[PDB]
Amino acid sequence: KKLPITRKFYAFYHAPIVKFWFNTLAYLGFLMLYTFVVLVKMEQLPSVQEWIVIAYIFTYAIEKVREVFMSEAGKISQKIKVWFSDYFNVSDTIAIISFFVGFGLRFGAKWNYINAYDNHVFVAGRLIYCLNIIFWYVRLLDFLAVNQQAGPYVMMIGKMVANMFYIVVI
Amino acid sequence: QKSWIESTLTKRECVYIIPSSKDPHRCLPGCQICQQLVRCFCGRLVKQHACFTASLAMKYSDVKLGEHFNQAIEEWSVEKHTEQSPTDAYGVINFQGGSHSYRAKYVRLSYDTKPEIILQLLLKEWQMELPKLVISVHGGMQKFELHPRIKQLLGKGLIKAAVTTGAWILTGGVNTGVAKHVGDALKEHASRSSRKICTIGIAPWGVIENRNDLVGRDVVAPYQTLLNPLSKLNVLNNLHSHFILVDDGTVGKYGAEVRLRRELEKTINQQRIHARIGQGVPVVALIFEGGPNVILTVLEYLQESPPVPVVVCEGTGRAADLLAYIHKQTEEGGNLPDAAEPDIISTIKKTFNFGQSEAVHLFQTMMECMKKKELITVFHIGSEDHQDIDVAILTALLKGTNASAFDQLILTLAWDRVDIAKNHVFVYGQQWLVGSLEQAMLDALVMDRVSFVKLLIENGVSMHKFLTIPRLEELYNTKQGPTNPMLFHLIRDVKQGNLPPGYKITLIDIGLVIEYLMGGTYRCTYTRKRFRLIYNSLETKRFPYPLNELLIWACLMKRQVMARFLWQHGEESMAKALVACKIYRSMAYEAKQSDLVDDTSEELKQYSNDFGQLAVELLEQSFRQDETMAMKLLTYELKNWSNSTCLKLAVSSRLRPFVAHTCTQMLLSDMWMGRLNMRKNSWYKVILSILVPPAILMLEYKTKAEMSHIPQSQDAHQMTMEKKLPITRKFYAFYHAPIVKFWFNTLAYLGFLMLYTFVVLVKMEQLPSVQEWIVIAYIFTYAIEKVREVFMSEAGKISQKIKVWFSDYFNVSDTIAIISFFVGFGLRFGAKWNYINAYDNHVFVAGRLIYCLNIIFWYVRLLDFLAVNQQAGPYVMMIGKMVANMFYIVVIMALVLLSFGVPRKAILYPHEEPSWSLAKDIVFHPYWMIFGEVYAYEIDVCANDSTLPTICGPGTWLTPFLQAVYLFVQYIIMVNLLIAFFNNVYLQVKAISNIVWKYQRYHFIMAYHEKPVLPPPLIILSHIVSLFCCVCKGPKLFLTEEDQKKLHDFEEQCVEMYFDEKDDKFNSGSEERIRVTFERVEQMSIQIKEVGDRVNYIKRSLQSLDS
Amino acid sequence: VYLQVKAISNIVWKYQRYHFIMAYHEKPVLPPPLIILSHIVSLFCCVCKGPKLFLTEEDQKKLHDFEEQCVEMYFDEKDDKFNSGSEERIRVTFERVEQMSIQIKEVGDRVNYIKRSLQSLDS
Ligand SMILES: CCCCCCCC/C=C/CCCCCCCC(=O)O[C@@H](COC(=O)CCCCCCCCCCCCCCC)COP(=O)([O-])OCC[N+](C)(C)C
Ligand SMILES: CCCCCCCC/C=C/CCCCCCCC(=O)O[C@@H](COC(=O)CCCCCCCCCCCCCCC)COP(=O)([O-])OCC[N+](C)(C)C
Ligand SMILES: CCCCCCCC/C=C/CCCCCCCC(=O)O[C@@H](COC(=O)CCCCCCCCCCCCCCC)COP(=O)([O-])OCC[N+](C)(C)C
Ligand SMILES: CCCCCCCC/C=C\CCCCCCCC(=O)O[C@@H](COC(=O)CCCCCCCCCCCCCCC)COP(=O)([O-])OCC[N+](C)(C)C
Ligand SMILES: CCCCCCCC/C=C\CCCCCCCC(=O)O[C@@H](COC(=O)CCCCCCCCCCCCCCC)COP(=O)([O-])OCC[N+](C)(C)C
Ligand SMILES: CCCCCCCC/C=C\CCCCCCCC(=O)O[C@@H](COC(=O)CCCCCCCCCCCCCCC)COP(=O)([O-])OCC[N+](C)(C)C
Ligand SMILES: CCCCCCCC/C=C\CCCCCCCC(=O)O[C@@H](COC(=O)CCCCCCCCCCCCCCC)COP(=O)([O-])OCC[N+](C)(C)C
Ligand SMILES: CCCCCCCC/C=C\CCCCCCCC(=O)O[C@@H](COC(=O)CCCCCCCCCCCCCCC)COP(=O)([O-])OCC[N+](C)(C)C
Ligand SMILES: CCCCCCCC/C=C\CCCCCCCC(=O)O[C@@H](COC(=O)CCCCCCCCCCCCCCC)COP(=O)([O-])OCC[N+](C)(C)C
Ligand SMILES: CCCCCCCC/C=C\CCCCCCCC(=O)O[C@@H](COC(=O)CCCCCCCCCCCCCCC)COP(=O)([O-])OCC[N+](C)(C)C
Ligand SMILES: CCCCCCCC/C=C\CCCCCCCC(=O)O[C@@H](COC(=O)CCCCCCCCCCCCCCC)COP(=O)([O-])OCC[N+](C)(C)C
Ligand SMILES: Oc1ccc2c3c1O[C@H]1c4oc5ccccc5c4C[C@@]4(O)[C@@H](C2)N(CC2CC2)CC[C@]314
Ligand SMILES: Oc1ccc2c3c1O[C@H]1c4oc5ccccc5c4C[C@@]4(O)[C@@H](C2)N(CC2CC2)CC[C@]314
């Protein structure tokens, strides 16, 4: 029993297994809040739950920018071509961009003060939230794919969609 | 200085320069030519010494002014005027890659190295193993060219002597003469056996080329093998591993190592060959094509204590062949044959020109080498004489140097060579001492020498007289063999942690390990009263069954090859295999629950499955011979294994293929019948006879002779010892049959559900109805019986009874069902009634609703009753295995569910306060869509035929698109993925479920021998009697003594038939017949070509006799 | 199509654990609501100022000996499996029985050259 006290904290928080659950628990708490935001009535100013959501997706987007620039290959345009080759990285790009399109229409709109959803710009911003949240539930399969048993089925669903295309066309 | 070589080893330089004899060559101006060409008497010339002290003396003219008083010219000895100095050389001498990389080492040491220092060099520093044989090859330098035929035999024989004994081969090192032919033997038959072969070349630092390239402290130097045309010097041989290099003067001066190599042989022969054998390492001398100095070396070996023997070859043709010819024309140790000395000395001088003067001096050496014939082994090639020189090398260490046959046998034991021991130690006429063969057995068991245990048993050693208590104390307490590092962890677990540092293990301690591994109520023969008292006293000091005692030993010491051998010898073969399956299995479970750097649990688990497979294959062999006698083998007490049972041992091991084998299933099917002959009855008749007790007496039963293979109770046996079976016996036979106890509980259980379904569907008043009290009386008395199953089951530890019982599915489900019933009955019964309207009391509602939910437990429990059938049972066990296997597909289906419900609720209902109804609404409708409900008129809420016209609003046109995607993913992808999952996993889950069903009929059927006759509404009558007879005051298979004798003869006969048909199936396979053809056609190709050469030796006389 | 897509999906899943696990050696400790604390530090230490397997010199030597030994064992067991197969043993039998048929017929002719001298030396 070696490893004094301040060494055992470095060992824990830098283990990849710990970084995973420490991102997973934060992601599940994110969806619980972002499910609350989208089911409950939205007022003019965002709620405290809704700012936490925005703070997540914003800071989550910065980390995706960092993964691109600081990955492997010296050529900057070669960093791009590798990263847009994965499924959920393309899905994150659509999810991050469409959120701030939706937050922009939501937040930067002239309110009515007599009845909500007479502003069609605010409706369109809210309805993008309701559709953007699908990206973030399907992303739980991305978290579920760490398991030895679940993982191969998640990768299987995509391969079966491609293989049955022409039966579905018929 | 970070160099063990520098503190111990020695270079040495000729610091004092004496010139050559008299003459500088040419070139009149004498003042320059004394430096240009005149050598030192060292041997090298004056410009290469460099002499840090005498470098200041070479400027005058040289060291040591002139004529120097001619007696003093010779004065250079290597002791006086040749100064020692540190290392200058060690490293890898890696040869330039030919076939492979071929590394080696070198030292460059002195001549005056002490014999203890050179021995310290080879072992510790160079990480070499202490050998078991030294083959010092000796011959003549530079001669050459064996024949091709003789090159294969002498090549193959030298390798198989060294790789099968782990030998050192001492050569000359340099590529001239012998080492060229030693290494070419290594070229042909290497098979990377340099791990076992360590050829050590002892050369000088003289005639070797590129000596200055090897200069360096810890230098991996490259070394070339190119035949230098202009040169005549010698290179090292590439296929050596270690080099010892001795310098007396310098380049030239071709001898300094003859003493040091010989003194190395003295040091090895003084070392013990093994830490159990007092005999020293033998040294042999192999003689190829020789020379004049060879004859002085051969004679120096024979004239010594100990007399090192000599092996001489022939066919090469030199002094080697002289020793072949001189030894041939000579009987036992007398002087000479008829006077043919002019024929001998003439043959001596054709090798080297001596000329009748000192060729006579060779003859006094040839008459002392014909003298000691017993230590000389000639290998005649051309008549397969003595079969492959590796036999003849190792046989030569046994013929001479007269010693005991014990000394001959234990020498072969260290070499791990039985074919020498069988064919040259166990020959006819050899006389043995009284306790020598026993000491050989004790050595062979410890050293893990299985094939010598086989040889000593065949040649007279009895294990009954051999294996004593103190000797078997030793077999556990050895580190001089392959030991188990796990046995010491098992001993401290049963002695509460005390561990003294010496700690000779006792057999009282081993028995506590066996009882811990076998588990349950196992009691070894070491921890009983009879053994402890005779263990204090120290024939009765021997064992009655020794091979039961060693088979446990071999398993606990993790010696599998020894365990498979000791299993085949002795009685009770199928039982010992099931014990060993249990012993390794328990050690495999202890290995995982222990902090070791070496797990070795997968090795033990494989060893457990090997003996388990042997048990199944003996049951299959016994079942084919006689079905009835094989069922007796499953259930007779063993009397040497704690009165246990081959079923009880296999069920303890969870060895499923034995319990699921058709022999045990016939036995379980026959214990189910009891004394009913259900081959000529029907299940209609058993049920009818439960309801009509006088219909019992119209049922065909089984006789005493039709039940000799079925275990019974003690008092049930008394009923059989006496159309037999009078009236009051036929009632005992019926109501105690397990098949009858089943239907008599099943009918009571179905009547229970019919009542408890009535109670829960019909209105409940304040006081319980008569139907409802019967229900309570059932579950109460049913709960008492479950408490009795826990306490009175198997294992003495009360908390271990708990852990086994909560491991089954329906026993956990019964616990929840029994507890939640009385929670519900408590809220139901013990509540203040209202008397104006029922179900205004929320405590009574909650009690009733628990009944409505508790009844699900009792319908699902009908699957527990349905699982007795051969066809339904495996499907019930299959349902559970399929739920576990499809978990992660269903999880994905649940995330797709939430991916749709959350946006649909968000789009369609934009004006919601926080409520727990939101959790309901995002799950509810999307779940029912999986099951056929499209909600057709709630799609497109803005349509005219919509049933939700007020939900139409901004953006509700998105939801038909969302639901189209949802159901495509659910039915068309995920439901069909789940159909496909079950199809392609069906066969291997149906198969596993059949074995699991067949395995657990044992615990099922053996439970109904202990259950009472009477069902769980009336069972309280049986629990009064069970307390009455216990305070006031399982089954066995009975056999008479003439049926135990017939059973032991059956067990022995079926094992004999097992190994015979196993050997006949192997020897009659196509794989084995092809290779024995391959090996015989190989030998026939050798002979016919060699007979084809003899018949060509015939036609030389045809031309002669035709003349 | 289940078995061959389930099989391909297992290998693809196992392949991409590398890019997955080696990504989490470079990700920050702290999750994406609080990760902005880690991006300040990452810009602080960069402007102001992957993993390796360390081995001592006596462990590199033990590793190179292991690599060499396992390659030697590879070609030996590859040659022993080929020379011990039923296909190769039949043909080496085929080629030797062919040569033995040649020799015995040709030794069978020599022994017929012997019986010419039997009638001679019997006379
Ligand atoms: C590696 C790859 C993955 C990473 C991708 C990361 C990049 C993601 C990129 C995201 C950018 C997406 C576009 C932003 C929105 C513009 C469009 C729009 O509809 O605007 C609207 C809002 O117009 C405004 O002026 C208010 C916007 C407030 C700020 C929020 C948007 C920017 C945040 C971005 C933060 C992202 C940064 C994340 C960190 C880097 C315009 O319409 P309106 O004004 O509402 O209506 C006018 C009429 N009315 C007033 C009568 C109603
Ligand atoms: C091997 C393993 C398997 C075997 C497991 C076997 C053990 C199973 C264990 C079972 C025990 C389970 C708990 C019992 C009920 C207590 C909880 C409860 O809600 O009580 C209620 C009844 O309170 C009473 O005082 C009336 C209870 C009458 C007796 C029935 C319960 C005990 C029977 C147990 C017989 C089991 C023995 C079986 C044979 C051993 C309290 O609430 P209330 O008073 O209704 O309401 C008060 C307010 N009001 C008056 C205004 C309405
Ligand atoms: C073991 C394996 C794990 C299973 C998975 C997890 C299981 C899912 C767990 C879901 C959690 C439960 C949701 C209900 C939440 C509470 C409801 C409540 O408070 O009030 C509601 C009561 O309604 C009910 O109590 C009925 C709830 C709906 C039935 C759910 C069936 C399961 C379908 C899904 C199964 C697959 C799930 C797929 C997963 C994504 C009503 O609201 P109220 O405000 O009380 O009154 C409103 C008045 N009004 C009615 C007159 C209008
Ligand atoms: C980004 C990642 C963060 C990490 C997560 C932890 C940090 C986040 C934690 C807390 C932040 C909460 C916001 C602060 C304000 C509190 C007020 C409040 O919520 O009141 C509500 C109570 O609601 C709750 O108590 C929870 C509501 C969200 C549902 C999910 C809770 C769990 C999420 C996290 C934990 C699960 C973790 C699961 C995995 C282990 C009452 O409703 P209202 O607000 O009066 O009305 C709403 C109307 N409005 C919106 C129009 C105004
Ligand atoms: C504040 C309270 C905190 C706790 C609460 C939260 C609990 C935590 C969060 C979520 C639940 C997870 C708990 C079980 C984890 C088991 C460990 C395991 O084996 O993980 C495996 C999968 O690891 C994953 O992370 C799989 C995905 C789960 C997290 C993301 C949610 C998606 C699935 C659910 C979404 C909803 C489902 C639908 C119903 C609503 C990885 O391991 P393995 O390959 O099996 O091998 C074992 C060895 N190993 C671990 C070293 C790798
Ligand atoms: C108009 C009405 C429509 C009618 C119906 C028809 C339309 C609907 C049809 C199809 C919808 C399904 C979309 C998935 C298809 C992916 C295919 C694919 O290529 O996958 C790739 C990965 O992708 C995955 O592994 C997918 C994992 C996420 C699940 C998809 C979301 C579904 C659940 C949420 C839905 C919730 C529902 C509620 C929300 C609205 C794999 O590709 P590959 O072939 O293996 O290529 C080789 C590997 N390679 C990628 C590395 C090169
Ligand atoms: C625990 C194990 C026992 C073993 C079983 C045998 C012993 C059990 C046998 C008999 C016990 C019956 C109780 C005695 C009182 C009789 C009155 C009666 O029932 O009247 C009813 C007639 O109902 C019937 O005749 C049957 C009602 C139960 C349905 C199942 C019958 C078969 C169960 C057993 C045989 C099937 C065996 C199947 C397998 C071969 C009329 O209704 P009520 O009662 O006027 O109104 C109810 C209202 N209250 C409840 C609010 C008051
Ligand atoms: C190991 C086993 C543990 C068992 C623990 C025992 C649990 C005992 C628990 C509770 C005791 C209940 C007694 C009353 C308590 C105070 C409330 C009260 O008096 O009345 C209230 C009762 O409200 C309810 O909800 C009653 C039902 C609660 C039990 C819920 C099921 C628990 C068992 C799960 C299944 C078993 C699973 C177990 C399987 C393992 C209201 O009624 P009232 O007041 O009479 O008048 C009417 C309303 N009025 C006041 C407005 C007029
Ligand atoms: C008062 C009137 C009394 C009579 C009436 C009551 C009749 C009796 C009660 C019930 C019906 C059973 C009658 C058929 C029995 C056939 C015999 C047989 O082979 O049994 C097998 C299964 O044995 C079982 O017990 C299976 C489960 C049936 C009893 C429990 C009810 C669950 C299934 C139904 C629930 C509802 C279903 C849904 C529809 C509502 C066992 O045998 P085997 O492996 O096939 O091998 C034959 C050799 N052997 C017998 C030596 C082993
Ligand atoms: C919120 C809404 C939920 C949404 C849906 C999802 C939830 C529903 C999901 C699942 C429900 C099904 C439950 C059974 C699962 C058992 C799994 C298992 O491990 O089985 C074990 C035994 O178990 C059996 O053999 C089961 C036999 C009883 C049948 C189960 C009841 C179903 C019928 C009544 C239902 C009637 C319906 C009406 C009543 C309400 C076998 O385990 P194993 O893997 O083989 O392990 C190896 C062997 N070992 C055990 C010895 C170690
Ligand atoms: C894109 C694919 C090809 C399709 C091409 C064709 C379509 C072009 C694409 C999109 C069309 C978007 C506008 C259509 C609405 C017109 C009618 C209307 O007013 O509807 C509603 C508002 O609707 C809105 O305010 C729009 C909301 C924004 C939707 C965000 C993108 C949705 C698609 C996902 C992104 C796309 C990618 C998805 C992946 C495939 C009605 O609200 P209202 O105006 O207040 O009506 C009065 C109501 N009242 C009487 C009750 C008060
Ligand atoms: O092989 C077995 C053959 C027959 C039975 C069992 C066996 O094993 C048991 C087991 O295990 C299961 C696992 C999953 C699903 C069902 C079961 C079952 C069922 C069961 O509970 C059951 C019958 N009886 C009591 C019931 C009164 C008959 C007890 C023994 C039992
Ligand atoms: O083998 C892999 C094992 C585990 C994971 C991946 C693997 O490969 C990836 C990949 O590829 C897929 C293709 C089709 C369907 C699913 C995926 C996935 C999923 C995934 O996105 C995912 C987990 N994490 C991020 C998530 C935080 C965990 C990143 C890496 C990832």
Author numbering:
A (entry chain C): 837 to 1006
B (entry chain D): 3 to 540, 614 to 797, 837 to 1147, 1157 to 1230
C (entry chain C): 1099 to 1147, 1157 to 1230
Copy text verbatim from the article accompanying this structure deposition:
The transient receptor potential channel TRPM7 is a master regulator of the organismal balance of divalent cations that plays an essential role in embryonic development, immune responses, cell mobility, proliferation, and differentiation. The TRPM7 structure represents a tetramer assembled of four identical subunits, with the overall architecture reminiscent of other TRPM channels. Each TRPM7 subunit consists of an intracellular N-terminal domain (NTD, residues 1–789), transmembrane domain (TMD, 839–1146), and cytosolic C-terminal domain (CTD, 1157–1230).
Our data analysis revealed two distinct classes of particles. The second class of particles revealed by the processing of cryo-EM data collected from TRPM7 in the presence of NTB yielded a 2.44-Å resolution closed-state structure TRPM7NTB-Closed. This structure is very similar to TRPM7Closed, with the pore sterically sealed at the narrow constriction by the side chains of I1093 and N1097. Inspection of the cryo-EM map revealed four identical densities, one per subunit of TRPM7NTB-Closed tetramer, with the characteristic shape of NTB. The sites in TRPM7NTB-Closed are contributed by the N-terminal part of S3, C-terminal part of S4, S4–S5 linker and TRP helix. Since the TRPM7NTB-Closed structure is nearly identical to the apo-state TRPM7Closed structure, the vanilloid-like site in TRPM7 does not serve as an activating binding site. Notably, a comparison of NTB molecules from TRPM7NTB-open and TRPM7NTB-closed structures shows that they are sterically identical and do not represent optical isomers (enantiomers).
